[PDB]
Amino acid sequence: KIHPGVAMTVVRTDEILSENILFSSRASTSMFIGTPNVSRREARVDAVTF
Amino acid sequence: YAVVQPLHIEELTFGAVACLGTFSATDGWRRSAFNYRGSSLPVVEIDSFYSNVSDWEVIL
Amino acid sequence: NFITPVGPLVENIKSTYLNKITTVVHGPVVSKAIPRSTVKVTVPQEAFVDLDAWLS
Amino acid sequence: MDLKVVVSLSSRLYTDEIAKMQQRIGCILPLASTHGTQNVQGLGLGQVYSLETVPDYVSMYNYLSDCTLAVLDEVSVDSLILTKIVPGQTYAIKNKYQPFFQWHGTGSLSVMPPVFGREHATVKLESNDVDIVFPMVLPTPIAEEVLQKILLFNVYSRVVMQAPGNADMLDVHMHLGSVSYLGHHYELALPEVPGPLGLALLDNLSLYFCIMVTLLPRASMRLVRGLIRHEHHDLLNLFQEMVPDEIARIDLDDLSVADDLSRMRVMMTYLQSLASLFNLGPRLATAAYSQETLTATCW
Amino acid sequence: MDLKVVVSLSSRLYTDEIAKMQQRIGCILPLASTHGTQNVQGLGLGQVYSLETVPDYVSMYNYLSDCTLAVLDEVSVDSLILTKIVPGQTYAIKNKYQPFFQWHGTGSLSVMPPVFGREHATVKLESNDVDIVFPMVLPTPIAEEVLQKILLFNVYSRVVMQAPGNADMLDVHMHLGSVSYLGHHYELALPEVPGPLGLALLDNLSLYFCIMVTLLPRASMRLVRGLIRHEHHDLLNLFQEMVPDEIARIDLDDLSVADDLSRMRVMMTYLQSLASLFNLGPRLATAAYSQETLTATCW
Amino acid sequence: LLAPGEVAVAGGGSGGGSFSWSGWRPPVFGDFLIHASSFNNAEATGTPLFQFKQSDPFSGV
């Protein structure tokens, strides 16, 4: 525990888990919706995925 | 290569590898027992297998 | 090189002298029984080694 | 049955990059996940090949053989639509890679990282803060030629550490630096430092060499000895009148067929497995190619 | 899906040549074009295996790997009907190949160029002034023994021509003359002691093999010495002991870096092209076979 | 079952002629004749098998 020629500066970052509140005023955005669909893909031996 | 067998002509080979098929990742190979004769054996089982055999490739 | 892999069991007739075994080579391994049941290839856990987890 | 991915951009792109991306329609690039909708971060080859990290060129190969290739189909302001490449289907793919190599009908194509340049491959998306790096595809005969050029550099650059020799670093850069083709010479971008995973591939190669060297057939060695003196041939013109001294020292005992036979039997099994080391990437099969249409039908 | 291909003939066949080709009704023919209607100049190997020029083994190998195979189904007076071989389909073949090898169920069949006489592979169609040539289909374990034995017989014949003191020809024919697989013994025929350099199939195969043999101990020794690093592959030191004494003494200073780089590069291009050659090209797998019907269920 | 394609298309002719649907390929089965004392009947129905290539010609087992 002798001193070398130099000092040090230490940096560290931390996380807080805040649980925030949101406010959105009326009629802020307008959205357009398309028709949804189902599609077949990857028919394996026993199983088919949709 | 050190204990028993350093070197010879035919005895050089170590082993071979082949491929037995393709199955789905992210699943398959659960573990289960194989019950016979009042004694069990822990066994894995693969789902949705697709058998596909290739030849042996020498590893060494 | 004298041993050739063939594939998982599918059907087995049990006979006194000469059995008749049916495997599936190069195809979706599927059971041929009348009420269908899923077939899953089984390997003893003592021999099976996950190469992907050992790598990790 | 249905093979389509919709890659969604978080932010609109600029009118110049939508125009640049459209020149690449019909090109392959590997995406990370096999899902119907994805981000842009899995799209290119950009994460493995970054500006802040050195290119390995062998970790990049390993990224391609693991990923799932897809063909770019349609480009818009907020999307890029692709169709994934699965084993049991046929595809129509265009030849639009910038260092231009011309394909033959009924040939086999190969997929390799952007060996010829970082800048030839990338379309920079500064709107979405990403660089989309395309892989380079080649005909198989020339792709193997480039892969060999890259590996021998990892050895010879290290062997010649800092040599004032005019012969060194000028011969290994004129021999290994370029790949010639029909009326052209294409420079390769070769790493300043041969990194790991490229030397570890050459370590496996050596193990095959340490084996093969003990079982070389001697009848083969005595043939080349007789031909380098007595006859004149273009293949043996590499050797001058001078004969490699190693062969005269390796081959002393008289030829015996029963020994050279079993030497050939053991050796041939190693070459069969040696071939697995060289492919190192995904290969395509092409059945039709139009010189003018620039569209193959790959399988 | 339509797999039929109708080959139309310019002129009607003789009543004899119908008997010749019907005998070969079940067997594989490589097809130039994948389209439904075709010419007769396409199907044979007469393009690659021709009476006028010297045939090559490594040239026919490159063709069969790319080409489209097909199976004969019916022969008419002026027609030939085939069905293409494509993935995901099961076909029934017969074996009608003049040098006869027995097949086995659940084995691996290989399609290799005809290394026996022309007369065994060909059917001459004088009416159209063409000969159609069939590739030979062997079980792979038989095809390997046949390859490496005719390859050695070519090296030993050319060697004894140089100085008859090298080898004894009677001892050669008895080793390399026979092939045995699974209790069956076959006495193959050997290409009539050719004599000049450049007149047979295997002469390029042997030269690529013989040159790769000589360059290996020099080239392999640069690797293990150049690769030694801090933390290399752990098996590297163990196999380096294995190399013969006379190879460990190789002095790398005798050859300049330029000449050493030239020899190593030539060796790798032969090594890479010789590995895949020994895999025996396009292979068909088997799931059944009947000795009396001669019909294999292959895919 | 009596349909030209390799897989059955239900309804007979109805819905027939698609022939390109998920590329479902049927399995290729193999049949082996075994010494009954060589194979234990209590096997897991799915275990991978291996055939040793005999060296006696014109055998039947």
Curated annotation (Swiss-Prot), chain A:
It comes from Epstein-Barr virus (strain B95-8) (HHV-4). It comes from the Viruses. Homomultimer. Makes the hexons and eleven out of twelve pentons. Interacts with triplex proteins 1/TRX1 and 2/TRX2; adjacent capsomers are linked together in groups of three by triplexes, heterotrimeric complexes composed of one molecule of TRX1 and two molecules of TRX2. Interacts with scaffold protein; this interaction allows efficient MCP transport to the host nucleus. Interacts with capsid vertex component 2/CVC2. Interacts with the small capsomere-interacting protein/SCP. It is found in: Virion; Host nucleus. Belongs to the herpesviridae major capsid protein family. This is Major capsid protein. Self-assembles to form an icosahedral capsid with a T=16 symmetry, about 200 nm in diameter, and consisting of 150 hexons and 12 pentons (total of 162 capsomers). Hexons form the edges and faces of the capsid and are each composed of six MCP molecules. In contrast, one penton is found at each of the 12 vertices. Eleven of the pentons are MCP pentamers, while the last vertex is occupied by the portal complex.
UniProtKB/Swiss-Prot annotation, chain C:
The chain holds residues 183 to 238 of 364 of the full protein. Belongs to the herpesviridae TRX1 protein family. Transmembrane segments: none annotated. Interacts with TRX2, MCP and capsid vertex component 2/CVC2. Structural component of the T=16 icosahedral capsid. The capsid is composed of pentamers and hexamers of major capsid protein/MCP, which are linked together by heterotrimers called triplexes. These triplexes are formed by a single molecule of triplex protein 1/TRX1 and two copies of triplex protein 2/TRX2. Additionally, TRX1 is required for efficient transport of TRX2 to the nucleus, which is the site of capsid assembly. It comes from Epstein-Barr virus (strain B95-8). This is Triplex capsid protein 1. It is found in: Virion; Host nucleus. It comes from the Viruses.
From Swiss-Prot, chains D, E:
It holds the Pfam family Herpes_V23. Keywords: Capsid protein, Host nucleus, Virion. It comes from the Viruses. The keyword Lipid metabolism does not apply. Its main location: virion. InterPro entries: Herpes_capsid_2. One of its GO terms (cellular component) is viral capsid. One of its GO terms (molecular function) is structural molecule activity. Transmembrane segments: none annotated. It is found in: Virion; Host nucleus. Structural component of the T=16 icosahedral capsid. The capsid is composed of pentamers and hexamers of major capsid protein/MCP, which are linked together by heterotrimers called triplexes. These triplexes are formed by a single molecule of triplex protein 1/TRX1 and two copies of triplex protein 2/TRX2. Additionally, TRX1 is required for efficient transport of TRX2 to the nucleus, which is the site of capsid assembly. Belongs to the herpesviridae TRX2 protein family. Interacts with TRX1 and major capisd protein/MCP. This is Triplex capsid protein 2.
